[PDB]
Short mmCIF file of N, CA, C and O in Angstrom, two decimals:
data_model
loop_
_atom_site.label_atom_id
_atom_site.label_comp_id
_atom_site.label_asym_id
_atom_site.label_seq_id
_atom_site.Cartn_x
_atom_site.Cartn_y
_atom_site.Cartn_z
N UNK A 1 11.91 160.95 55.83
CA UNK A 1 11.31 160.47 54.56
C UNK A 1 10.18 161.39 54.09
O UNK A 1 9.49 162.04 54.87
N UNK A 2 9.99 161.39 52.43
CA UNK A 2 8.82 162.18 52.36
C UNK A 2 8.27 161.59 50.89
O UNK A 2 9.00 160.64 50.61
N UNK A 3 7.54 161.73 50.12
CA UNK A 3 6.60 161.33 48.83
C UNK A 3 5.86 162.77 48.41
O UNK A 3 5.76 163.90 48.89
N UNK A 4 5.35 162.00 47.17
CA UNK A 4 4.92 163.25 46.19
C UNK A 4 3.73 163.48 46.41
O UNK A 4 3.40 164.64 46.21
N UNK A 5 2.87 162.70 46.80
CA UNK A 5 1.25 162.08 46.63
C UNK A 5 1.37 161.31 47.95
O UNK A 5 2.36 160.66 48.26
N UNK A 6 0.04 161.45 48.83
CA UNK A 6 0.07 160.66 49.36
C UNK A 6 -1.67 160.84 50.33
O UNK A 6 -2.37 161.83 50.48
N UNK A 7 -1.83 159.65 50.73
CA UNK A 7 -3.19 159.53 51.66
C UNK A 7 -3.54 158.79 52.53
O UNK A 7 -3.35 157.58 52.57
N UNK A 8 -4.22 159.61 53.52
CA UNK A 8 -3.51 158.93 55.14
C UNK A 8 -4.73 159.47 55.68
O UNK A 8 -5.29 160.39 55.09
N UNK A 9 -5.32 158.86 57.03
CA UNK A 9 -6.51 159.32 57.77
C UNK A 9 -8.10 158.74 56.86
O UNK A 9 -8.04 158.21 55.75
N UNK A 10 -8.95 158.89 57.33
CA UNK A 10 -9.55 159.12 58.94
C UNK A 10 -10.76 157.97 59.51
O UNK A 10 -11.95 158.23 59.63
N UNK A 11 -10.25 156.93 59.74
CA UNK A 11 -11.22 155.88 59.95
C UNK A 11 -10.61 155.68 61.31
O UNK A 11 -10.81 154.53 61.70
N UNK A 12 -10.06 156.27 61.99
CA UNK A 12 -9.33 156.22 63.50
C UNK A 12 -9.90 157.66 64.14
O UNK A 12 -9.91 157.83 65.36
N UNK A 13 -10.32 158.54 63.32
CA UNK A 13 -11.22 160.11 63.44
C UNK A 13 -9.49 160.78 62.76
O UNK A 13 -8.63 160.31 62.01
N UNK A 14 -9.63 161.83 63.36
CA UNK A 14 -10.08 162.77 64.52
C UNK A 14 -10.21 164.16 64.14
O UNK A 14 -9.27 164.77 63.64
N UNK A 15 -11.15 164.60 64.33
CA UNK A 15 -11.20 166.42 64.70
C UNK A 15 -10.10 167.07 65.76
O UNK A 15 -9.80 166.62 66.87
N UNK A 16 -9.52 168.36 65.06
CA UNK A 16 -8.93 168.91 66.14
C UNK A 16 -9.29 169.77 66.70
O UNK A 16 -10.50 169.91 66.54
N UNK A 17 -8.71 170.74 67.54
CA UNK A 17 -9.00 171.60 68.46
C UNK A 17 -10.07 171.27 69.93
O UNK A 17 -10.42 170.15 70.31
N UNK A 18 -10.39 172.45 70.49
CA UNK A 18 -11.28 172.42 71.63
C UNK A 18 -12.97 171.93 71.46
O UNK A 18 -13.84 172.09 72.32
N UNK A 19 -13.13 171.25 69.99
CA UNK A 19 -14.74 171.18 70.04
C UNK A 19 -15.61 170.50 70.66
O UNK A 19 -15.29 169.33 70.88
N UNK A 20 -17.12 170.99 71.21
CA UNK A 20 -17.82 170.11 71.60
C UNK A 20 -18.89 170.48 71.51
O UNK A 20 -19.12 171.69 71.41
N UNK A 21 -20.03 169.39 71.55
CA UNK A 21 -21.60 169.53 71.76
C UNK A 21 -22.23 170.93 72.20
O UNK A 21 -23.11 171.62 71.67
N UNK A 22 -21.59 171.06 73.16
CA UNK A 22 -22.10 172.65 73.63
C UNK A 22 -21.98 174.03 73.08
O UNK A 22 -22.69 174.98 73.44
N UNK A 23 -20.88 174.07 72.06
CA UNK A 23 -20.87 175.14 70.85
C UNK A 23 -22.45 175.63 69.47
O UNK A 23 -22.66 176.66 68.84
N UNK A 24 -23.48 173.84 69.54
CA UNK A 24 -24.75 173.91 69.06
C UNK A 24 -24.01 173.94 67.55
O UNK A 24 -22.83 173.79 67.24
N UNK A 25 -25.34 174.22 66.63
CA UNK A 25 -25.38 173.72 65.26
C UNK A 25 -25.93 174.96 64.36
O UNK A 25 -26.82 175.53 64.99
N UNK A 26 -25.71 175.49 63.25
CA UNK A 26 -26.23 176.51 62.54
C UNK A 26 -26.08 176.55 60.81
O UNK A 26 -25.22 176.10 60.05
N UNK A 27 -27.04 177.14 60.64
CA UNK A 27 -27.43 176.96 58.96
C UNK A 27 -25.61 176.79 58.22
O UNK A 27 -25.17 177.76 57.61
N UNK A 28 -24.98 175.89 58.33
CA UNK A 28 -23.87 175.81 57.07
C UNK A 28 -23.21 175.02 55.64
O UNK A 28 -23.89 174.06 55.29
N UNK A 29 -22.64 175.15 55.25
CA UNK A 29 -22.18 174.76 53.77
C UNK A 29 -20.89 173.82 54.27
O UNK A 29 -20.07 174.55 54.82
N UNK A 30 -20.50 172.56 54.25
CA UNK A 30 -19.53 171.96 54.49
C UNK A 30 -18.85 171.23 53.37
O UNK A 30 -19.08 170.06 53.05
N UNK A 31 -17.55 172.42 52.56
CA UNK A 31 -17.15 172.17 51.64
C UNK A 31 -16.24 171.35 51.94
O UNK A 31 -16.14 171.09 53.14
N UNK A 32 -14.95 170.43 50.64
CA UNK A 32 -13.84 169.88 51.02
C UNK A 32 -12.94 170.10 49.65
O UNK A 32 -13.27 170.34 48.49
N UNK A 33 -11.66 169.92 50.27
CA UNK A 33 -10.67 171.15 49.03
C UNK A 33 -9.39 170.05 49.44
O UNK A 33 -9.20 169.75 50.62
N UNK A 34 -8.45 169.40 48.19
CA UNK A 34 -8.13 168.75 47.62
C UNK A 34 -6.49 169.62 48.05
O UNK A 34 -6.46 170.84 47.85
N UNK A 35 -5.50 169.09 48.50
CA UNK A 35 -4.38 169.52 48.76
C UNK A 35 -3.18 169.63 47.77
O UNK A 35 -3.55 169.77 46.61
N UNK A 36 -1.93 169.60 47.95
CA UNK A 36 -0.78 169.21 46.78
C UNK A 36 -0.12 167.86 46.46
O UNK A 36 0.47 167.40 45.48
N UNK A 37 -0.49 167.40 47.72
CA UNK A 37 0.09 166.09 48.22
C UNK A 37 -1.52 164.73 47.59
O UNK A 37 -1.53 163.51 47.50
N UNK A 38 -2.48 165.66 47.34
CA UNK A 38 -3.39 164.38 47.01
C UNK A 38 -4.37 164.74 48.28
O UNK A 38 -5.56 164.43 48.15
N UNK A 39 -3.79 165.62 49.94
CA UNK A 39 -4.56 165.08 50.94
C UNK A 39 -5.75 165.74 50.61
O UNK A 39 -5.64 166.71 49.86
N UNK A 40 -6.94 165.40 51.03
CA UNK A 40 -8.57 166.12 50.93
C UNK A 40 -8.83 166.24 52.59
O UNK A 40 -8.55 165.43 53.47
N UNK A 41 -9.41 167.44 52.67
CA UNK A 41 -9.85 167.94 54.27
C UNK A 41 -11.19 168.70 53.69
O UNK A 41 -11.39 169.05 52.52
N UNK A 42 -12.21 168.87 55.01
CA UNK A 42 -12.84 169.35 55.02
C UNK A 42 -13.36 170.45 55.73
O UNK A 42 -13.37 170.26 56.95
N UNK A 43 -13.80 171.59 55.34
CA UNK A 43 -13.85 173.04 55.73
C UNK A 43 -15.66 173.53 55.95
O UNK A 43 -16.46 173.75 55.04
N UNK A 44 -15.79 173.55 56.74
CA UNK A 44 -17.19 173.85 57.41
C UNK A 44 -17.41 176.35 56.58
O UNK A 44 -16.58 177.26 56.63
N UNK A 45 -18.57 176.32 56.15
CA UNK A 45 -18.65 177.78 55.90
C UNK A 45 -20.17 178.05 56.48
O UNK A 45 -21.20 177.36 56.53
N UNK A 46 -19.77 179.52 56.94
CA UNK A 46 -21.41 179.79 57.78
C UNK A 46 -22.25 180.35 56.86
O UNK A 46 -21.80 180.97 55.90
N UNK A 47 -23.59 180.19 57.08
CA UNK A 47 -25.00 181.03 55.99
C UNK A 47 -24.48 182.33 55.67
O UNK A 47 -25.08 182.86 54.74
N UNK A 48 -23.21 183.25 56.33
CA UNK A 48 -23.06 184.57 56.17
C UNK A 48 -21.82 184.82 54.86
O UNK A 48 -21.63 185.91 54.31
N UNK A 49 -21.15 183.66 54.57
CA UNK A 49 -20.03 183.18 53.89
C UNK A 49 -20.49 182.01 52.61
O UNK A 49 -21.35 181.14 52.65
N UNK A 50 -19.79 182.30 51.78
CA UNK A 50 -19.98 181.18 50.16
C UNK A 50 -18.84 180.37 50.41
O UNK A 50 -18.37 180.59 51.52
N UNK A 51 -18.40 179.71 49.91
CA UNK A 51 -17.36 178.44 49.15
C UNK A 51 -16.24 179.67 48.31
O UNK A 51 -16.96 180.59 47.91
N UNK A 52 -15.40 179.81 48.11
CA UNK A 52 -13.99 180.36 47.32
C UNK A 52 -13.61 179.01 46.72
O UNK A 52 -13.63 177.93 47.31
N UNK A 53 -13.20 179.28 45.21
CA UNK A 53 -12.87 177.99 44.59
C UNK A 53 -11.34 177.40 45.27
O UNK A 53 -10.68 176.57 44.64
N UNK A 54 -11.00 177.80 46.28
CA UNK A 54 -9.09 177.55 46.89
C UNK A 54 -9.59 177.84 48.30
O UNK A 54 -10.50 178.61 48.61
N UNK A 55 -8.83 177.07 49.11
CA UNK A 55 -9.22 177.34 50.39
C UNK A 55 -7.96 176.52 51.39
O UNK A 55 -7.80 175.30 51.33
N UNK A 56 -7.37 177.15 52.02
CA UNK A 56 -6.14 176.64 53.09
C UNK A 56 -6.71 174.95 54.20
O UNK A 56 -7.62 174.95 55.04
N UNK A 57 -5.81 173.73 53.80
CA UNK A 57 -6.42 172.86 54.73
C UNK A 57 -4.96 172.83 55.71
O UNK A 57 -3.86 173.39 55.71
N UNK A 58 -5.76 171.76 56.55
CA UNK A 58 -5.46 171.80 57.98
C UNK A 58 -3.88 170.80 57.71
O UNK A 58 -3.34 170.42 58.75
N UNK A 59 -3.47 170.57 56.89
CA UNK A 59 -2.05 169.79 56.65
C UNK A 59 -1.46 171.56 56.42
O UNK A 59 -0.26 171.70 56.66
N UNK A 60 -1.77 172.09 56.25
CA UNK A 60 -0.96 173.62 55.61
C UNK A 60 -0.74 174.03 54.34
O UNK A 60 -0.03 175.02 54.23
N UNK A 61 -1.20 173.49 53.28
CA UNK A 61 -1.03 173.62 52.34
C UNK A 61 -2.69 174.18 51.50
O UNK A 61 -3.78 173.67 51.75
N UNK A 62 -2.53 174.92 50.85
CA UNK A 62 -3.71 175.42 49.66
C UNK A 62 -4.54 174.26 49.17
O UNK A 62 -4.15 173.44 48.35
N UNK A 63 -5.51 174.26 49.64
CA UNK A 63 -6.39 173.19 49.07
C UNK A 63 -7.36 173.72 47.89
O UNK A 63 -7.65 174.91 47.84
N UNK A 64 -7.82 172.82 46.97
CA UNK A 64 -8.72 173.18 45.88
C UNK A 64 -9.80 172.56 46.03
O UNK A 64 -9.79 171.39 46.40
N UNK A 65 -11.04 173.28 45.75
CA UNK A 65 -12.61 172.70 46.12
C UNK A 65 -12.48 171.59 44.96
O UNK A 65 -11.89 171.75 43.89
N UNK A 66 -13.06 170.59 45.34
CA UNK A 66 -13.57 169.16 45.13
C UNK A 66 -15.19 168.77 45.61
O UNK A 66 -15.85 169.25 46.54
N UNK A 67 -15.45 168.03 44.94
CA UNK A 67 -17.22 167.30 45.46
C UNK A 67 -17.15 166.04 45.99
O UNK A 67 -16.75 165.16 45.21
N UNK A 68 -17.47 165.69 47.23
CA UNK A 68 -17.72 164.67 47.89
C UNK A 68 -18.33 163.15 47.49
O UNK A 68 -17.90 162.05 47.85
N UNK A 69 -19.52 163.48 46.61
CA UNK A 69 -20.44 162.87 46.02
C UNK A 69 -20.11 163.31 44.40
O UNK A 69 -19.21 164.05 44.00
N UNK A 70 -21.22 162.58 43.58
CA UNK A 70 -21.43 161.87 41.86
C UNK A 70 -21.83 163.34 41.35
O UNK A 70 -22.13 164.41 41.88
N UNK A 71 -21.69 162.87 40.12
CA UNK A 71 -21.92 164.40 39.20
C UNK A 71 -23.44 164.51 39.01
O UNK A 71 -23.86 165.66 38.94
N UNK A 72 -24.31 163.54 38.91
CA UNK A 72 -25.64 163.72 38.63
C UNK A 72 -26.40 162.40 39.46
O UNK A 72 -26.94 161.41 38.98
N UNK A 73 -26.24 162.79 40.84
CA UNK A 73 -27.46 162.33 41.57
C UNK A 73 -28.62 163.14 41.56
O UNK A 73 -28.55 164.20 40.94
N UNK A 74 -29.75 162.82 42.17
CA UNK A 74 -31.00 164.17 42.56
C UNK A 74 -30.10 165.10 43.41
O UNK A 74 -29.91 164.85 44.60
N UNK A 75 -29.38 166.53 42.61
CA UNK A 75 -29.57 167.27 43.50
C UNK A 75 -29.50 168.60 42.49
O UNK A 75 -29.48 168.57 41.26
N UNK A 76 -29.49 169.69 43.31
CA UNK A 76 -30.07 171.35 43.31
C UNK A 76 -28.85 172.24 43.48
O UNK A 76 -27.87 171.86 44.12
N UNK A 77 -28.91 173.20 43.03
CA UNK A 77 -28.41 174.73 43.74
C UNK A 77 -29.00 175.61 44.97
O UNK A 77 -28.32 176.18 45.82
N UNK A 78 -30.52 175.61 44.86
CA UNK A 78 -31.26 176.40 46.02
C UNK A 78 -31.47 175.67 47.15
O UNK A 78 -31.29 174.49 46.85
N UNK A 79 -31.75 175.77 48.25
CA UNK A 79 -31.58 177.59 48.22
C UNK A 79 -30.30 178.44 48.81
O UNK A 79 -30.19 179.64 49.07
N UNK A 80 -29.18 177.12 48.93
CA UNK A 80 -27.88 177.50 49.65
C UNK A 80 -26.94 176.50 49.14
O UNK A 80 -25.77 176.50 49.51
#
């Protein structure tokens, strides 16, 4: 079976791969990019790297940057 649209995950988690606590934490940008299917994932970028308006998610497919949050809460551009 398959559909055109669809949305599934994550109130059960999960993160994949090998991660843990002991890898530590560093200055980043944690964008999220909008799939074909509807799915939304989210893509972690380091202080050395920007946001690209298209970005590959973890279903396999080309995702498109999206905003998490409202168009006009208190917030900024600077300083990252």
């Amino acid at each position: 079976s398959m559909a055109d649209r669809v949305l599934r995950g994550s109130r059960l988690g999960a993160v994949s791969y090998e991660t843990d606590r002991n890898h530590d934490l560093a200055p980043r940008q944690i964008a999220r990019y909008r799939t074909d299917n509807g799915e939304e994932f989210e893509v972690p970028f380091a202080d050395d790297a920007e946001i690209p308006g298209t970005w590959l998610c973890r279903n396999g497919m080309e995702g498109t940057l999206i905003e998490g949050d409202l168009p006009e809460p208190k917030k900024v551009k600077p300083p990252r």
